[PDB]
Amino acid sequence: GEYPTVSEIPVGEVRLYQIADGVWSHIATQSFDGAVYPSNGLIVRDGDELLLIDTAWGAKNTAALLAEIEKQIGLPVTRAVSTHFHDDRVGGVDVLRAAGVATYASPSTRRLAEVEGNEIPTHSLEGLSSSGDAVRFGPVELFYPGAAHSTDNLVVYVPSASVLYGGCAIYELSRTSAGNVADADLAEWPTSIERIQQHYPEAQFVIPGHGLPGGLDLLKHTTNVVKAHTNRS
Amino acid sequence: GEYPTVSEIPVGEVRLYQIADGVWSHIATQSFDGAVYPSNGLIVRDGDELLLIDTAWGAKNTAALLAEIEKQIGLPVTRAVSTHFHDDRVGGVDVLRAAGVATYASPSTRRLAEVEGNEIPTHSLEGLSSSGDAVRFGPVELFYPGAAHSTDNLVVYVPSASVLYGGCAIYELSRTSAGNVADADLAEWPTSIERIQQHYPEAQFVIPGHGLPGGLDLLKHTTNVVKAHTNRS
């Protein structure tokens, strides 16, 4: 009802939606395969500065993201984390770096991003290489649930607000079929999701990579969709 | 350019685009899988009445389509053709029929729609049962190129304006991967596309089922995508 949709967001623009105190999602609309969809990332306040989760796909959009943050929040983004290596999550990293933002990702993501020719976050996030690994990063906890949408995908939990951002490892309810699974691990995706359920059973707000937020139901929904795809179809 | 996009068209709204004298396309935005795509159909003037090609997917959208035609063109829609049996092309037939529009489709389409529990056009178009078959239908020529997006898909040519509408058998250039192919004949799709090229080499405007129109280049693009999907990209 209040959450921004593609109808409110022209391609190239960015909206912010405050989930809780000091926690926002940033929403940007992207063109793909001739379709337009809303892409989610996360913003989390940390003291008097901001932690960014994922870009807005590309230089232009990521510049628009920084401008929307300054307009609505007005605190500096000092650090940024990319949840996996695909261009829509690391695209814009160069703009962030040039603006003075410290960019972060796992060695797995940086590795894969380089092979793909994508932009590469400067700093490496250690202690996330094994499935089930969790590390604290300021106002959030980074978690590697195992392979799913990609072998390197991370999810982000904000303990102060009980917010779980799943990136493309989590589907919105409106998504009834599998998205881009070229780099996915269909055999492991359900198991990885269950690691998330087990580790964050208290989560109250779940943010999918694309589309509308919900509750923990989005996990079982995603599993249902992934399994249906596996059985083809 | 100037062809309308999803941004200019809110969900549930329909816009018309004049391609040539007495030849429009109608564009409606649909939400599917959490993404929004712009869906094309055709409108061809025949004397002092109009020929409609395909609905706007759904009773509501099709009602809006009839309202937009009435507002912009102000000539009665007396006949309608659905190009294949899927709900986005026959969904709205009941609204059209209630509005006094004579609805048409091949016997193949009507049977497949009935099996699927979709709305069924009243009239049966004979002479389109075998690949390469063409028949005249007022100001257009209907053509069955053979199985492609579906076993029953038709394409429509307007000889007056050299406009070719291919429905979901033709992809826009922005579409790099196969869309819904559950009911498609991937094996025959390239061969059917070549029948269209052979039959309408003089086509100047080519309208894909979804998205931006182009030239005959759209044909080879579609084949390339289909063959890649066959070999699994």
Ligand SMILES: [Cl-]
């Ligand atoms: Cl630093």
Ligand SMILES: [Cl-]
């Ligand atoms: Cl730095």
Ligand SMILES: [Cl-]
């Ligand atoms: Cl009738």
Ligand SMILES: [Cl-]
């Ligand atoms: Cl009649």
Ligand SMILES: [O-]
């Ligand atoms: O992605």
Ligand SMILES: [O-]
């Ligand atoms: O379709």
Ligand SMILES: [Zn+2]
């Ligand atoms: Zn991805």
Ligand SMILES: [Zn+2]
């Ligand atoms: Zn640094």
Ligand SMILES: [Zn+2]
């Ligand atoms: Zn179809």
Ligand SMILES: [Zn+2]
């Ligand atoms: Zn009749």
